[PDB]
Amino acid sequence: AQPRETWGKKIDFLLSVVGFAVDLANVWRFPYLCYKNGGGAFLIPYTLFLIIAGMPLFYMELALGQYNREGAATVWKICPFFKGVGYAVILIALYVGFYYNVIIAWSLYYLFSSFTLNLPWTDCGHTWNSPNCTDPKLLNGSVLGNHTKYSKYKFTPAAEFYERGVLHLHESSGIHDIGLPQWQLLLCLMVVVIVLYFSLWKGVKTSGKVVWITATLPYFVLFVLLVHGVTLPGASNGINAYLHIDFYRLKEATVWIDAATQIFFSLGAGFGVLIAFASYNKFDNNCYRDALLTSSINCITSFVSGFAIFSILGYMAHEHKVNIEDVATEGAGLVFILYPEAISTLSGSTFWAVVFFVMLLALGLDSSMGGMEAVITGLADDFQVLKRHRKLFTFGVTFSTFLLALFCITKGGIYVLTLLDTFAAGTSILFAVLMEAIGVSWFYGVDRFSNDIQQMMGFRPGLYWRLCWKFVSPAFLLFVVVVSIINFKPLTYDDYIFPPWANWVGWGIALSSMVLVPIYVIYKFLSTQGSLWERLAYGITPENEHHLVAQRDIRQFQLQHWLAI
Amino acid sequence: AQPRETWGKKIDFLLSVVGFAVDLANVWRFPYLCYKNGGGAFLIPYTLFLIIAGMPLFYMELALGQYNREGAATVWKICPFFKGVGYAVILIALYVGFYYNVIIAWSLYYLFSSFTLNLPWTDCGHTWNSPNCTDPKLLNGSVLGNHTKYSKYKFTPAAEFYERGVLHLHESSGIHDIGLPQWQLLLCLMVVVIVLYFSLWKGVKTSGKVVWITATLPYFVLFVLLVHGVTLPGASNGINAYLHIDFYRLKEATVWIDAATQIFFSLGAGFGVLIAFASYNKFDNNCYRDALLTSSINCITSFVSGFAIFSILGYMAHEHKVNIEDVATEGAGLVFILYPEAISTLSGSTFWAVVFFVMLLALGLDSSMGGMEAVITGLADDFQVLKRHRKLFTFGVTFSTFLLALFCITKGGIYVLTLLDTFAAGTSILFAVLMEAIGVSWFYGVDRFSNDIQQMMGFRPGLYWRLCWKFVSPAFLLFVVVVSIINFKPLTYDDYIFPPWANWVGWGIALSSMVLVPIYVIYKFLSTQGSLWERLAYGITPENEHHLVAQRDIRQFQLQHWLAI
Ligand SMILES: CNCCC[C@]12CC[C@H](c3ccccc31)c1ccccc12
Ligand SMILES: CNCCC[C@]12CC[C@H](c3ccccc31)c1ccccc12
Ligand SMILES: [Cl-]
Ligand SMILES: [Cl-]
Ligand code: NA
Ligand code: NA
């Protein structure tokens, strides 16, 4: 038979795509970036690159998943030369998990630390926190002053518990000496992969069943946190500072460059996750309304998450006597630095901390389930043997992720967690989707894509989407790729500086995913027999239409195909 | 078809079974252990445990390979319950290579260093050697004194070049801080695996073609080295010290146990290598004469290698004015410490050094080819899919060995090379051969084994072999296992105290191979349907004789089977 597995409960697909859209990025990247770019001057470019990019790629991916009901790697049965591109979106799907699951363990250790009456991030001292030699200072009892940002000030109790209490960074000095993997983090990383295996072994049914909770919990958590925080003193400061009427902070090195990255990273369009989640769906399904609703809910959730984050920041600035400029933070780990301390500052800190940490666990587990579904599903469709042994392939993928995420849970965990995040999703996931858009628009045609969409739902997409898919979106992706490649800085942590070979290793990891396109192109060209004008016809023409290759009448070789809008 | 691949040239099988036994062990273990256990009082226990063990296991393995023409794992088609034991002899076959190939790279770097007019081990100084500020001392220019053994004296030029010049141990502090893998060793470890892949991809033909040289070279090398060394002043000292008329150093402890492990480690009997090299052989082949000749050549080669080693040691003691007690050496690396320096002490050091290093390279390549061939043949005869794609499976095995031997080529390479060597072949390979002998003698029967041997050649083995296979060899193996388990000392590499978790990791690595027997027994018991008295019949009875299982007439359940000699 065929693994259709259509969602009997229609709400399952919507909840799944919403969960895949809303992740920790919407929590910790949107608020800081919005203020750093201007606040009110960040929402307009966000909406601009949200209607010219994202939503177009989201619609394209949904249509490719529904019409071409197949896997992520095998979605290119209409353009075999770009099939290797699918492999890329699988590898990028794995490397990211190598650190992403670790970010879930960091959300579990704290969750285990929150089952107490006194929280460790409240005050200094050995409370599962390793204090330094008189360096940790109690800000509540010491009003002397501060000379660094709260993200850069590694002497606060919360930052101390994050660096030494959880990660144990005090016994690591770089990637050259990583040390031994922490066992308290190994248990928290093993429970996560066990849950992922037990939730992704039967198929998409249990996946949607777990999504039903892991997606609905964070919205309620954020709503309750906003209701509690808006009344706290300081929220009016942070909300009105990050959202100001005179939001004019635009330069050429600003929102027009930075909003281009957050959109793609927060939406999730252009990935095997959407191709898989749309393959297990009915053929006559409206995906335009889904493409609009998912992106709108994603943007509204990012907006309210920034609201809550800056309310927390304003409360912290009104309680620690610091200015809003110093409350702006950077780095990968931020939901663990400022938010647990702010929860501790309020009464009943245990309940709010447990709720926030179970929200972060639900979000992380849902995102990891999506990422591992992009791998387990989409690769089995290529190798028919893996389809029947789905439990075994799921176990193998989970065990490989567990055994290859040990470098990110070591003593220098953040030193091997800011290296994969920077290169795996930094540039590879951009060239991959650029090649995808090119193969879909210029090689498969936008008119044929529109006809397929009309056969799916019943209406042909307007000229706007047809022009954005071939002209606007590919140019946008190429521009972002050029900006990422040319404007490249050496990877450096808050204070640590990576050795020169670290950049080489990161670029090699990026190339491992990026060069999958030309390698597979050469493989397909050499593995086929015929003339030089016939091997080209195998790779730019649909498989199910290969019978027309003998007829010598191919639409692609005509001029009307490339100039169709 | 069937991959018979019988040795058309009969000399190929002999060279393969002989070269596989003669390796670096026969070079660096037999001489020191012989003198430590008595010298002339060590040849007698050697011959004793060479006729009650080894030769019996060698004959058994050759007969199992010739009669049961299959792989190492699937040689148990007559006793399925012990088939998992085969898996052990595969895994132990891989872990060893993880360090063994590294020992080949150490024989290549020196080989590349010997293409000069002045050798680096001659005198101190930066000559591809990293010395200390004032630790290295010129023995020719400084006759002050010495207070440590030449093995542990890390201030000699050759020892300095071995520790810091090649391995770069100065920038390592143990297994907790291994550092980055050395590239000068990475290239030498990659060339070796490339040669292994290009020599083991076609099959056993190119394997025998390469063995034709890699086995014939070391004998000529040792012969020329002995001819050159016997005339040097000092050889009469070392030869007469390690071989003395009053050789009486007898002790109840550590005099018969050391030979018991050295015989097994230097012969190779009881391994998938013999089962593989005998599977690709004619059915009507004399293996008794082969089992005798291979072991005799192995012992004679070990004897002459000890002769040459102690000739070199006596020359060094007569030249450096040290006593023979201080020239006795320990540790894994010895052919690189004393032998290159002794070659340097003679005129024309470049030629003798190149010859000795190409001999070491030939021996290492032969051993690695034998091990990888055993692995590939076992995993191919177990999984029929891997038989046709032999090139791809060979490439995968070589690439996995290259990517998993990077811990042994690091700055602290000898710290990850004395851990696998101690636990992989220390105890697991002994319990494996114990289970093999038990399943062959008590479960398959020695009378049936003798009948199979008679069907192979034409004569039934005598009562001596039939009694040693069931009584002497299993008791010997159990005694060696008990001594290795009870008399266990923590790993100490030149007074370096390994952390407590190192012993746990080593025992876990040993268990990964050892527990393959009960796990597979439970798997076979649960994976079969029937009564409790019928599931036992599937696993202790031959597969091709399973038709008798339904007939309720099984020889194993009778008393005459267990009491047959
Ligand atoms: C909006 N994105 C949220 C999901 C994060 C995600 C989804 C697939 C893969 C991945 C690659 C690039 C970017 C983001 C991801 C991944 C693997 C494991 C966990 C999470 C992921
Ligand atoms: C006396 N014969 C020496 C061969 C050394 C050998 C043969 C199989 C495996 C192995 C296990 C235990 C002991 C010795 C070995 C191995 C893998 C790679 C290189 C060499 C080996
Ligand atoms: Cl977003
Ligand atoms: Cl020997
Ligand atoms: Na999510
Ligand atoms: Na050898």
Short mmCIF file of N, CA, C and O and ligand atoms in Angstrom, two decimals, chain B residues 20-21 23 92-93 96-97 100 265-268 271 273 367-368 371 425 429, ligand 2:
data_model
loop_
_atom_site.label_atom_id
_atom_site.label_comp_id
_atom_site.label_asym_id
_atom_site.label_seq_id
_atom_site.Cartn_x
_atom_site.Cartn_y
_atom_site.Cartn_z
N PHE B 20 50.30 -14.19 8.75
CA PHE B 20 49.34 -13.74 9.75
C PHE B 20 49.81 -13.99 11.18
O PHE B 20 49.55 -13.16 12.06
N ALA B 21 50.51 -15.10 11.43
CA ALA B 21 51.00 -15.39 12.77
C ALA B 21 52.21 -14.53 13.12
O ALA B 21 52.27 -13.94 14.20
N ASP B 23 54.10 -11.46 13.44
CA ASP B 23 53.81 -10.03 13.45
C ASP B 23 54.73 -9.35 14.45
O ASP B 23 55.71 -9.92 14.92
N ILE B 92 35.98 -8.14 18.29
CA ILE B 92 37.35 -8.15 18.79
C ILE B 92 38.30 -7.97 17.61
O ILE B 92 39.41 -7.43 17.76
N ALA B 93 37.88 -8.41 16.43
CA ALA B 93 38.68 -8.23 15.23
C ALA B 93 38.74 -6.77 14.79
O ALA B 93 39.69 -6.37 14.11
N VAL B 96 40.78 -4.25 17.93
CA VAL B 96 42.23 -4.37 17.80
C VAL B 96 42.76 -3.52 16.65
O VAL B 96 43.71 -2.75 16.85
N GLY B 97 42.15 -3.62 15.47
CA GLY B 97 42.59 -2.80 14.35
C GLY B 97 42.58 -1.32 14.69
O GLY B 97 43.45 -0.57 14.24
N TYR B 100 45.77 -1.15 15.96
CA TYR B 100 46.81 -1.88 15.23
C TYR B 100 47.25 -1.11 13.99
O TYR B 100 48.45 -0.98 13.73
N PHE B 265 48.49 -15.20 21.75
CA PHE B 265 48.59 -13.88 21.14
C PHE B 265 49.50 -13.90 19.92
O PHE B 265 49.34 -13.08 19.00
N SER B 266 50.47 -14.82 19.88
CA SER B 266 51.43 -14.87 18.79
C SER B 266 51.08 -15.90 17.73
O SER B 266 51.59 -15.82 16.61
N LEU B 267 50.22 -16.88 18.04
CA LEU B 267 49.85 -17.86 17.03
C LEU B 267 48.67 -17.39 16.18
O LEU B 267 48.73 -17.45 14.95
N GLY B 268 47.61 -16.92 16.82
CA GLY B 268 46.40 -16.50 16.12
C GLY B 268 45.33 -17.56 16.06
O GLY B 268 44.26 -17.31 15.48
N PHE B 271 40.48 -17.78 15.81
CA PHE B 271 40.05 -16.48 15.33
C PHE B 271 39.39 -16.65 13.97
O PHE B 271 39.54 -17.68 13.31
N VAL B 273 40.20 -15.23 11.35
CA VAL B 273 41.18 -15.18 10.28
C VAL B 273 41.44 -16.57 9.72
O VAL B 273 41.50 -16.77 8.50
N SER B 367 49.03 -8.14 8.89
CA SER B 367 48.11 -8.39 9.99
C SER B 367 46.79 -7.65 9.79
O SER B 367 45.71 -8.20 10.03
N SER B 368 46.86 -6.39 9.34
CA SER B 368 45.65 -5.62 9.13
C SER B 368 44.81 -6.19 7.99
O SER B 368 43.58 -6.25 8.08
N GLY B 371 43.07 -9.33 9.38
CA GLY B 371 41.94 -9.00 10.24
C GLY B 371 40.75 -8.45 9.47
O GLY B 371 39.61 -8.88 9.68
N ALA B 425 41.69 -7.69 23.44
CA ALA B 425 42.30 -9.01 23.33
C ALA B 425 42.79 -9.56 24.66
O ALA B 425 43.40 -10.63 24.69
N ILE B 429 38.71 -12.11 23.94
CA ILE B 429 39.13 -13.11 22.96
C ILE B 429 39.42 -14.46 23.60
O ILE B 429 39.48 -15.47 22.89
C1 LIG C 2 49.33 -13.64 15.67
N1 LIG C 2 48.59 -12.99 14.61
C2 LIG C 2 48.70 -11.55 14.76
C3 LIG C 2 47.53 -10.86 14.08
C4 LIG C 2 46.99 -9.69 14.91
C5 LIG C 2 45.47 -9.60 14.85
C6 LIG C 2 44.82 -10.69 13.95
C7 LIG C 2 42.97 -10.32 14.04
C8 LIG C 2 42.88 -9.11 15.00
C9 LIG C 2 43.54 -9.63 16.20
C10 LIG C 2 42.90 -9.90 17.49
C11 LIG C 2 43.58 -10.38 18.52
C12 LIG C 2 44.83 -10.61 18.44
C13 LIG C 2 45.50 -10.39 17.31
C14 LIG C 2 44.83 -9.87 16.11
C15 LIG C 2 43.71 -8.12 14.30
C16 LIG C 2 43.24 -6.89 13.66
C17 LIG C 2 44.13 -6.05 13.03
C18 LIG C 2 45.42 -6.36 12.99
C19 LIG C 2 45.87 -7.48 13.56
C20 LIG C 2 44.95 -8.37 14.23
#
